[PDB]
């Protein structure tokens, strides 16, 4: 196989904007004997986020466009995309749970993929249908809810992986769980201590969550 030739490829692909080839090469490198160097880790993080992101965006728009006869095609078009969505998330939610989380014996990485898991189940949670919805909205809670606690006993708020979490896990409430009180709370909180107390990354995350309470 040659592990670092796939890394060598995922670099090139990204530097070529065609992001599927990119997630493929990484999907590969992780379905190897994991413990993805942060580099690879992000590459993977970036690539997969681009595809599933690409789908979300398209899904959103098309839902509103749908949600008439034009509508059934809107529907048909939606499902087509939802699928593509689901298969991407089903795909990354694998590597995470089956290679990543268990092949990252370090706190940093621990809290990370636990966001990712949550991030993805969350996407799967928007796009849902019946009780499967509840099944996946819950699977996301626990996953987000497991590193918040992990970040919490292993490293600081002024660190972007935790701050970030707070943001996203906070948002898990508005868009998803319907607990604005908890979202806002979590955001005021994780923002709060952030201030208490390298440079940029934190700062950035730090604003966005505020920017967010400005909404809620």
């Amino acid at each position: 196989m040659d592990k670092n030739e796939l890394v060598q490829k995922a670099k090139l692909a990204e530097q070529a904007e065609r992001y599927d080839d990119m997630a493929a090469c990484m999907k590969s490198v992780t379905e190897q004997g994991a413990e993805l160097s942060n580099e690879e880790r992000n590459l993977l993080s970036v690539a997969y986020k681009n595809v599933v992101g690409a789908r979300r965006s398209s899904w959103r728009v098309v839902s509103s466009i749908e949600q008439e006869k034009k509508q059934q095609m809107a529907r048909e078009y939606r499902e087509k995309i939802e699928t593509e969505l689901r298969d991407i998330c089903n795909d990354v939610l694998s590597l995470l749970e089956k290679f990543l989380i268990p092949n990252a014996s370090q706190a940093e990485s621990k809290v990370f993929y636990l966001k990712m898991k949550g991030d993805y189940y969350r996407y799967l949670a928007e796009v849902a249908a019946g009780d499967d919805k509840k099944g996946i909205v819950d699977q996301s809670q626990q996953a987000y809810q497991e590193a918040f606690e992990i970040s919490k006993k292993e490293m600081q708020p002024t660190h972007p992986i935790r701050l970030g979490l707070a943001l996203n896990f906070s948002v898990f409430y508005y868009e998803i769980l319907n607990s604005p009180e908890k979202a806002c709370s979590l955001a005021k909180t994780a923002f709060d201590e952030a201030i208490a107390e390298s440079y940029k990354d934190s700062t950035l995350i730090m604003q966005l969550l505020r920017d967010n309470l400005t909404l809620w």
Binding site: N42, S45, K49, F112, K115, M116, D119, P160, I161, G164, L167, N168, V171, D201, I205, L208
Partner: peptide, 5 residues
């Protein structure tokens, strides 16, 4: 770095 929205 991490993920953001």
């Amino acid at each position: 770095w991490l993920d953001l929205e």
